[PDB]
Amino acid sequence: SELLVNTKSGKVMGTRVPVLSSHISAFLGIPFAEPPVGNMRFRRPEPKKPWSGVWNASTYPNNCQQYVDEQFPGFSGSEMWNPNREMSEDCLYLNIWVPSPRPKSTTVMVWIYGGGFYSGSSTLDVYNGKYLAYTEEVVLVSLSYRVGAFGFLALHGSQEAPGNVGLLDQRMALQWVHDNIQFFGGDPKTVTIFGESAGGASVGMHILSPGSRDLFRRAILQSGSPNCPWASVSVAEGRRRAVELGRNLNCNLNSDEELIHCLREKKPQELIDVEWNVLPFDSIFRFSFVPVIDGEFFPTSLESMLNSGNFKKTQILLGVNKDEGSFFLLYGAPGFSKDSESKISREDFMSGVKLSVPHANDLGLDAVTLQYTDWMDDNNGIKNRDGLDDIVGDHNVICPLMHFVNKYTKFGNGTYLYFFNHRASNLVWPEWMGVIHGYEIEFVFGLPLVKELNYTAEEEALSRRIMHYWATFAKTGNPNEPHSQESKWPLFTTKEQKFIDLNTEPMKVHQRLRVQMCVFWNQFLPKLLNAT
Amino acid sequence: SELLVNTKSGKVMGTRVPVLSSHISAFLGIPFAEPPVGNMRFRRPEPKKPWSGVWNASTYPNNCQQYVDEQFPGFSGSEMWNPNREMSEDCLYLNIWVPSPRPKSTTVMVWIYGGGFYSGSSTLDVYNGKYLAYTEEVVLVSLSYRVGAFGFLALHGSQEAPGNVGLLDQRMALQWVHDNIQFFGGDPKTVTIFGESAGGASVGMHILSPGSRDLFRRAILQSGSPNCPWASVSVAEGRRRAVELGRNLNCNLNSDEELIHCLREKKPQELIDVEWNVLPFDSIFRFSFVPVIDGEFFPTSLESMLNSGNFKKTQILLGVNKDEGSFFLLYGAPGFSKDSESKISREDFMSGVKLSVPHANDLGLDAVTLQYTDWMDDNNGIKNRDGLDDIVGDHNVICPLMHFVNKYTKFGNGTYLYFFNHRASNLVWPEWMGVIHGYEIEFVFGLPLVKELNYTAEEEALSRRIMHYWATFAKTGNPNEPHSQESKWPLFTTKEQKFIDLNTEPMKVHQRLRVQMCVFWNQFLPKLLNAT
């Protein structure tokens, strides 16, 4: 049987799924770790014990316990990101889409979902890997990992809650892919990890971590970078937030053992209900429980690893969307709302700057405000709104990613950089938010190929071109077809720093993506804050 | 006789001078103070003792002792600024041009020359007041004042060299105009002081100083502002430079009396030869002996006088030239030269920034460099050259003048702002220097009306329009003719902040002259330096 696969952990039985009037095989909800429940909450994952019999891999698994966005009940724009299965701490499963007939040794792509390390599901309609596996003839894997406190509570020095266990969840799934994907027709020597947002940061963290480097061949990062300001905390700040979490739950704080024991007796929703109460500042684009710079997963600081070349040298493809910040301003910043144009007043602008750079002193806030204010037209509500959008996106996504790519290209083996700026014709979010955070995913996963979705013919053509870029990159290390007649995506080099736009228009090459602002965020402001 | 005028100091005999195929009267070299020679060097001026007989006022007086620019021997572009009479400490004289026939009670304009407070002459060909007096029918006065150490050596606390005596020279000339200009046909109640560069700063200093306010009606400032970074020093810094001056001349430094006595035994050229050796920094656009914030001429700091309204409230007309900085880069900055395009390398750019903001720490230098660097095109030699030009001009002239005008308009009675950006067709300086510092003076003094000078018909039309703006402003407080059909120069208001271009093209109104850069120079950088 095409749907029966024998693995080193046991046999699994998949299901035949239709896709664009054909069919492929899907193996949904394969366990890769022991359920991290009870006294294993906050612990490192353990490999799943082999099983006898046949694992029914015909339906999606549970999603991990997570905060659930209820800000717009019924609205698909936000609920498309919410968990669409029951939530459970028993949630360490992966899903595989496999071309039919079963390949022998084909390119493997492993998807790592984003969601700020506090949320995310592998089972979202927008992550359905069947279109990409079918169209490009690749083995498509999506893994899962613990998020929020369950994945990232960090009391460094203790072995019961060391931190980073959600990253270790991802690594263990990558280990299982390394060890078993051959039986599904995948080539364990040609595995590309790819992910968006926290998933893109995660991808970059596996490139850096010595314990993860050997488990994949190359990597794709979408709107995410390991050095992002929101993606990691120090050991001291991780400890402080874990203690504050227990303080919110009336825990005995006399020792790590007392605190962890208290936090394990709590129901999952009890932790989630107070999770946002431990942030140190009034802020947007900051999340409570994220990777910790521990000296283990990450042997030294991220910047010194980047500067010294202490990371996996391979090919990478990566990029950003035009309007990375609008998301977070809508949810947290005064003056923004979903059903208005969100024109911002000079005083809401200043409130927004403070929420966006919460670690800045007054001089730094002035530096930011000056950099993004048109003083011929300071009370222009559109300019203030788009200025804040740029501030949030530059500071949190684009300029960290540009710092990463410039450091990486010095030691790496090939870099391809993109700027995604097509706004989907069927977006339900307001126009002011622009090319939103995450709305390139549907093009990467081939959703425009499904008529019922609406989607213009030009958007289907864009999706196919993007899918073939990603999959050709995964297969060869280069998104371009050799000897093809199509425009060519040029290499990003230290000298030229070229990149392409991704949209429905003929390809255009540019250089030095947002270099003016990123010199401010990467060189000047950090220097200003350290001196003052 | 039309050429004989009896004054309160004695009778004076002028000369009939031809002008544009007509004639007017000129009274050149009228003494207004006692010669500040010998033991009166560095002292306050004393009024000139009345004389018997007739003072021969037919020829120009001596120029004050000053540094003489020899950087380009023979070149008219630089020598047109050098003294064109013998130099002498006996140099406190004024010149009057008087329409023919002698008026009864007409508008008076008093010209105060610039030259960084270290140089300047009232007798320069470009200051010949006969064209303006003839064309606009006004009494044109040009005064003189001590410059360099002779005018501004400041040992505060001592009465022998208190500082500011060059400003007191100007005031005493204004007193003499107040007291005697009626006998030449001038209206002592309608006197406009005007000046360029240090002369424009001087004008603003008389607006501020309680001891000068009553001696004039309104004021014109060209490319100069009392708050300019180069126009004043503290009492401590003035004392330090005076002591360093004596150290350069092997003076006894045990007391003020010993130091002043030593400096008075020195020949004028001995002081001039070492004058540039006392500057505290490697710098451009900084001069050794300038006005001192003494608590007398200026009762408090300039900024607190400006903020509290402690100044003469009247009408002012003022403005700047497009390329205020190119002058000083040519003479002092590496990579600039007179006979090349002066394309600047990224490292000469950084050297120039340091010379231009000598009081900046490293963080401030970074802030400036960032503000003026196009990081898409950092090695563009033209952009680096023009960037430095803007840095020098914004920091030293334009943004101080914009701070002054914005503070003044809050309490004043009418403000007219201009931006002069016509490059004269006959300029002998290289094209890269643009609309140079001081090359609007020839238009203010009507030189384009003289055919022999070359000068296009459009430049003659510009000169006449400018002369009539200045003279109508002097007469009424408003540069525009009432009920005329011509475009109207609008008032500068706190709310709108309108100004006009001055060039050969049809008038255009703009708002917020160089506001982006001036917010950097007037608000952010000062804040950055105070915190760090």
Ligand SMILES: *[C@@H]1O[C@H](CO)[C@@H](O)[C@H](O)[C@H]1NC(C)=O
């Ligand atoms: C696998 O589980 C689903 C869950 O209800 C069930 O409907 C399906 O029939 C099962 N298949 C097998 C072969 O047990």
Ligand SMILES: *[C@@H]1O[C@H](CO)[C@@H](O)[C@H](O)[C@H]1NC(C)=O
């Ligand atoms: C990648 O590495 C190989 C050698 O292993 C080298 O030949 C090739 O030029 C490299 N490519 C880039 C883009 O650095």
Ligand SMILES: *[C@@H]1O[C@H](CO)[C@@H](O)[C@H](O)[C@H]1NC(C)=O
């Ligand atoms: C005034 O002085 C000049 C200087 O040489 C002289 O040529 C002229 O004749 C004098 N005029 C009178 C009236 O003394």
Ligand SMILES: *[C@@H]1O[C@H](CO)[C@@H](O)[C@H](O)[C@H]1NC(C)=O
């Ligand atoms: C100037 O002052 C007079 C009163 O003395 C006033 O009527 C006039 O409006 C003022 N003009 C401006 C421009 O402030």
